[PDB]
Subunit: 525 residues, 4 copies
Amino acid sequence: NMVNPAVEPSMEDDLFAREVAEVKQWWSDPRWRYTKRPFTAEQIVSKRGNLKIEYPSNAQSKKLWKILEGRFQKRDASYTYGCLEPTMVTQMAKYLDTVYVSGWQSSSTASSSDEPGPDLADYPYTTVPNKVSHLFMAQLFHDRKQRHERLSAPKSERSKLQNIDYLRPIIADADTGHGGLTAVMKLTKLFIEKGAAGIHIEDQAPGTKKCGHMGGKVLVPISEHINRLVAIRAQADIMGVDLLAIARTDAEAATLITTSIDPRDHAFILGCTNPSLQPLADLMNTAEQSGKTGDQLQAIEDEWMAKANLKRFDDAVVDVINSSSSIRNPKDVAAKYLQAAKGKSNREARAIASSLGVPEIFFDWDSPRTREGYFRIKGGCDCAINRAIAYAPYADAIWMESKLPDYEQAKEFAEGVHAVYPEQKLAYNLSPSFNWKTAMPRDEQETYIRRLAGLGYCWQFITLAGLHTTALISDRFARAYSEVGMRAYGELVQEPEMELGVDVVKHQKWSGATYVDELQKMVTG
Amino acid sequence: NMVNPAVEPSMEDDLFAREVAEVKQWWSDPRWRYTKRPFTAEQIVSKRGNLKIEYPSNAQSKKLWKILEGRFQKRDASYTYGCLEPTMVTQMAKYLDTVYVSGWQSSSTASSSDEPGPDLADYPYTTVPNKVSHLFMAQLFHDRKQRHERLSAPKSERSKLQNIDYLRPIIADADTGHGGLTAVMKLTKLFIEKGAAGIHIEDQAPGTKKCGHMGGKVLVPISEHINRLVAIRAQADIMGVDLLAIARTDAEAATLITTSIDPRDHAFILGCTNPSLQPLADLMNTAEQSGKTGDQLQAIEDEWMAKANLKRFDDAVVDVINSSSSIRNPKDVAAKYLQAAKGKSNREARAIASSLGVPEIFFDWDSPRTREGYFRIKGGCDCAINRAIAYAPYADAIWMESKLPDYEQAKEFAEGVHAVYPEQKLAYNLSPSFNWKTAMPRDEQETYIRRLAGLGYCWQFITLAGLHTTALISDRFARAYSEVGMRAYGELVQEPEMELGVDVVKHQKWSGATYVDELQKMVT
Amino acid sequence: NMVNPAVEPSMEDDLFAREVAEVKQWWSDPRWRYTKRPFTAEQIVSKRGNLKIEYPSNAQSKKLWKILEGRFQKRDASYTYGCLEPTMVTQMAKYLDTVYVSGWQSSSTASSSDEPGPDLADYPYTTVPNKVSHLFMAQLFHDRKQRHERLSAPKSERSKLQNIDYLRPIIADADTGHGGLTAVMKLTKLFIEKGAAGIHIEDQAPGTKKCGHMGGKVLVPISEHINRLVAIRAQADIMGVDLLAIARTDAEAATLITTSIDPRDHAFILGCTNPSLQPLADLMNEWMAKANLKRFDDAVVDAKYLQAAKGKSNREARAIASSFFDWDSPRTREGYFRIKGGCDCAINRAIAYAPYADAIWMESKLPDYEQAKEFAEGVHAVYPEQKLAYNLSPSFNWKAMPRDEQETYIRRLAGLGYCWQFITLAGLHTTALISDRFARAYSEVGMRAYGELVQEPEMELGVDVVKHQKWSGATYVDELQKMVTG
Amino acid sequence: NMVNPAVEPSMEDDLFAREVAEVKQWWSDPRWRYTKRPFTAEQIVSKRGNLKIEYPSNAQSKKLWKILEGRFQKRDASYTYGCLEPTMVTQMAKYLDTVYVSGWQSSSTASSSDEPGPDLADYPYTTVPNKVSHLFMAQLFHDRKQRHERLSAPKSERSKLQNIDYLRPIIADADTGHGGLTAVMKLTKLFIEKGAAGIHIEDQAPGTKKCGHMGGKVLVPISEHINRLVAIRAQADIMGVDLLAIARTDAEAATLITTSIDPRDHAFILGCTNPSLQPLADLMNTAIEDEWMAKANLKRFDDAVVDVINAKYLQAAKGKSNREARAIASSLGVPEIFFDWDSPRTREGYFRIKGGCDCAINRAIAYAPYADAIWMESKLPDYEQAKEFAEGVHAVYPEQKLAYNLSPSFNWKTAMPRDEQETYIRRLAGLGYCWQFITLAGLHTTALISDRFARAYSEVGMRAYGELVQEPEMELGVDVVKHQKWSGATYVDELQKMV
Ligand SMILES: [Mg+2]
Ligand SMILES: [Mg+2]
Ligand SMILES: [Mg+2]
Ligand SMILES: [Mg+2]
């Protein structure tokens, strides 16, 4: 009949050991020399099914890895930008060796539910993985098309034909993982199934995520983001692919953090140094239960914050030492304090301060909590480096959002991470949020990427360039077209296309009309 | 107890009666003064369910209808181009009053399966409606975004704020219908559900459909395309909306037709006039059943075709008249034959030539059929005019593809149609497949749309302008960007956006970040 | 020249005022007599666009409202179960007046990405709203099919035909909202556009959400769940629909809470009473029993201060006392707090959610009538006309109740005010049962099993689907065709 | 910088050559011994891209082939039925080695647009492949879940656990290809990407696709359907997979055909033998049809030739084009026969044909070289007819696998005695019908239990759930009764603990 087991019991153990050995051998590849796996080959194989699946995503990540390995070793950089759709990706393939898929661009132009909006990662998590597939399936198509044209013409005739590399690895945005760890693994699975060569996940909290240059970004504990990076690697291992994992931190300008449970975040959590105040939350509640609204509540909250005199604990300590009237050598004590207290938890920092003769210090990080229950933090490059260093073992590349295209801070960040992991690859957001004309003169704009590459930033990208380029020409053309009709098409579009040799100008051929026509003749012939 | 009927059997008839009355009242509206409906209000209402649904697409078509009514009457035109995605649509809204969604563009950039390819209408049929929805949901969002910013500001400060009309009616490509009449109705249903103000369907056959300017187009019989147009209207009626139905004919350049069953197509079907030849099918068969396969079989067909001496029937008749000594008045016989046989079936035409004393005409349009069984046909503007006239009662606007931006032929096509229906709106494809620099000087390029508007082409569009504009800026920026890094971004993109005052340059605000933040606060 | 404003400047204020007036008029309807809106009609309108859209969803929620108003007032109840797909829905339509779309069933049979998994609300949030569309579009189709049949047939023969009400209002699972408040509004927008008559949202946290009868369920603060419920009403108001919002609380068996920020939650947060103990988190590198966790009151009562401490924060609670409690040490690794759930806790939460919910549901460990009575009475002691909903969970082992009590359970709960009841996974279970039974028999005796276990039974019960072609709408579509070419 | 070619010009030729070699090697495998490929390996490779992709569809394809090969050789059969969704597929997996995905069922319950309707193949063509993915992703998940459970337990205890083969090969409905040849290859590409082990395609016309037992089905020419089967194999070859291609013919009951261009169709096309009549179209336009039809005295050519005579004609006229048949008939003294198959045409332009089993055998034999299995859509469960069809096809291709659709509509209660009902499948398998299926069983079982339960539930409430659902599940040991474990809660909980 039709009854049979998935696997004959007699062979279950054999197949398991054999597969386990294969994974341990795989993990030995140089690809993983910087990767820390807090789990065993046995644990991973034990989660796999009986049918091994191969993914073209794997090939692309291997390709991407070969590229970034070179770039970093030579202190050069591969740079690209956020691609919106297929037309754009086929043109980018001629000059850029990678492709970036922006979640910001996806919210405004590719939500799988078609409901657009600001960059809040609040679209269905199928969104970015579907954009990857949208571009990848188009890349695979134009590759087949072109190979067909090339192999179809006499060898001596090929020098005239194009030879574009359409299979440019795609790095996609995973936002914060769209939920818990089980969601992170499912998202990663889609990304691999859809073709991503690599993905990036940020240490922000889902439900509140904002674009890197917004005020009020909320972070998650360092341990939680590490879990996310581990979950991604675990899912990739289960699927047997080399998907690159990129860690992004928003600790530079972040002002909030979900919990203070992780001692590594203690040094940066703001505490109320005023013993007389009642909790902000209590104050704010009473304020609302009294009709206070808008600017009132704000004023009431603003005053509380000021009287609170919020500071990181080390600052609270240094201020006490310097204001003292009994402590001998304030500079010496403060100096010894800061040195020993670095990276210590709050309890240990307090213990250190007391051992150095400083009196007890009032420091309360609960009273300043927001109505949601979040804690306030004073981030910055130092906070960013701390996090990057902690993520490093679980990240193939690290990225830190910044406020301006500041070379020095990029240097500061890089040297900070490299002090611990000299070979850690770095990625950088050449954000269009920065007013580049105001930020730096042309000559420096022209060398910025190169200068950053010298620092280890081997992969750089202009997040929203696709959006802006499409908007600019659309605004320009639609206007001209409305003013002078077809004169605008020939002048602003068709002629420039010819002069530049844009292959799309010959739309029929560019679309694969001949390619499919030959597929047809082959079947009917 | 949870058992109850959908509707009380006692009131079923009263409700049906009232609905029918409404449908009839709706049909008397001037919106339908040119519309021929081969079915009754009772038939339509009998296909409806018990829960009436209203679609924003209906509002969009009414808006479209008002716009096109105005243009045609003033002999002006609204013109737009094929929009690729949301970023593009929000910019078009500033200068263009309508939006076009191309099936061609959808093939290379928007198939529902993500499998791209050439314009063959072979992607899943949800492809174009989904693109309509993609753009329509974005327009809706941006209209919300802008109203909030405007209403949130003091009346006195609004003059400084943008006042873009994002709700530009969308006209979509329904290809040939993606299957039979039931497929046509399902397609129209999704278009209506996705926000389409109008859709266009062409007289090519699905499966062999292709680019409007590609050689070898295959036509379906006139009756078939009319059925499609009627199917569209019926579905719109069932759903209670004013969806515009635009008919497109590919007869100007088409060389094939699927069948010879429709007498209206007989005047154009090509027949072999050499009684010594054997059917092309048998020849090619016998030929391939012995190697030769390749360019040899090709040439073998060209020769047959040459020997066949193919002609439209009227010409075959006239050729026999001018070579029959038994005919005393050849000029009179020919003229009389042409006058009477005009628009008649082959059988009627043969009966006419017969009555006029014309000898037996050897004409065989079956022998020239392709291996797929397709008949040959000589189309052209005259064939297209004939089809447009036959489609007009079931089409809100008519479109005839052309080989070149030829004003004279466009005027010829318009006159042909207006001779019978002087108020028939027309549509024109300002094709980017045409070499404009080579077609007409710049000053004439700028008057072209207006010239065409004077003829009644009240709605015109550059099918693939979105593709090309996007390709251009992408090639240019990507190249420069790979050459001078960030210098190119500020020089070619950011600074120009600033100069031009492009709202997107402040992407956060443009994306609706302020709008959602206020939604947030409202909910506290 | 194709350039024109969205709205002429001189009309904007007049259009706003009029629309704001319409909304205030709408909100005065008795449908909203229990509804508390912490926002104004003006705030809502200034969030709308210039094109009003009407949804068949609004019609269904109105029909649903009319149904539940009746059930509650008569102290009866409508009961249904989770539906899997169209075939099942066309059959349920004949006997039950509402339809339920389970998030549990959706995870195992309908993720938008096709990746199955346990009930963790970790599929793309598009999942459940799509399942609603799936069934609703099918309901609409069959409504058309049947109307065509009845209307086209001789009036004297209509009594011999079916007259099924396929338009049975659907209530769907919105899990915990799938993220932040903006996600909640987007999800609601989807449910409304897809056909939902009402949706339910629970006070668990995304990422940790588990099915009602799971172990350590984690709750969000009372205030956070209220925001979710207000976000839902807010989206419905923007869209102009009457969508029902059902509040579910998992407080009866929850053991953890994300934060202690809300004072209404203080009365249930467990704190260590052993000064000798060091933080639990530190030890994890048991402590519990030794910690002697207690609620502040069960620690203060060691006379009648409880009467003035009721519903007070810990700060205010301590104050009352004067005239050792530490809840930080017990915190989990994630930073969560320990809490003692229970009916009392659920009642407290139910009461806080009430002004923002059309119906309230409290998960229970067993189908316990007495507990259901206690919950109902606790809520009603404050909001006597608050509709309640109940999960006739297939997770329970009914034989927990004798056959005779099984038959009256729904009726008894109905007396308590549980006007809407549902078996979450009945759809999954019925399909599974018949599938196993049939596939097994079919593998043994071939077509004999089909004639005996399926075909013959269908014809005897007169299942309309047995006439597959007619059922699927073959005659309906065939007529549509003849009408177009006729 | 970042510019580089897709492939170095100095390597293209060699890679091409090596890949072309691999394809020829692949095609020499026994899997393809019965397969005719009207194209070259060089033609296929020249259509591929530079990135090779592996599909689990292929592994399943191989598995299915191994199964069917065994079945046919032993004259046994694998049989299954149309599956609706994941729940059903996990139960079917215990007792059935294959899974069928019905287009009919997909139309009433799975259109990718959610718009249901009768079986007319007019849903978006992503419908069926999407259903395949729906079931396959579910199979893959449960396979992992169970593997983890089994491996996580000590060997000595595994015999107490389930060991269901969830990876049951899925055969799916491709209708008529959903349009032209370019659509056929696209639809085939999706099926392969989605996980199909095999697909079947029928010889009806797409715009008028009807379900098997329908009134007037329209057929495409033999050559057109062969083009579809070849298009399927080509796409499979391009993708490097072993996808099974099943050819279905509706010629047993079809009454129309799009065109008379294919000579192999000539012996079945009905013609008018009445010379005094005007074409039907002309008649209809001048405005009765049945009237014309009757006065037309429609017959197949061979029959028209006979009547004329009243004759070795039938012998030499076998499988001959009309122009040949005519040439034959006359060479035997027979007078010019009046035959016109263009006058009977429908208003859509369709020709009339008299189908039947002989017509179906003809088509099946014509498709055989391009099909891994052949199926003749039939309505009545007639053992003798099935025998007639199989012997007809086997007379030419004795090792040609056959498929069979077990009528879900016909009344089996009176169709044959119970004994005969139980042996029907076994008897067909003996004829070479190595894979059989009940297209709509999934629909009916779900429909049956739903009506029964919804009714009982509305009558006795929870009592009904205990009596008709929960108790039986427990007594039958249905794993789904413990929904949490079954859904994979422990698998995911453990997955999370690992992280
Ligand atoms: Mg982002
Ligand atoms: Mg088109
Ligand atoms: Mg749930
Ligand atoms: Mg089918």
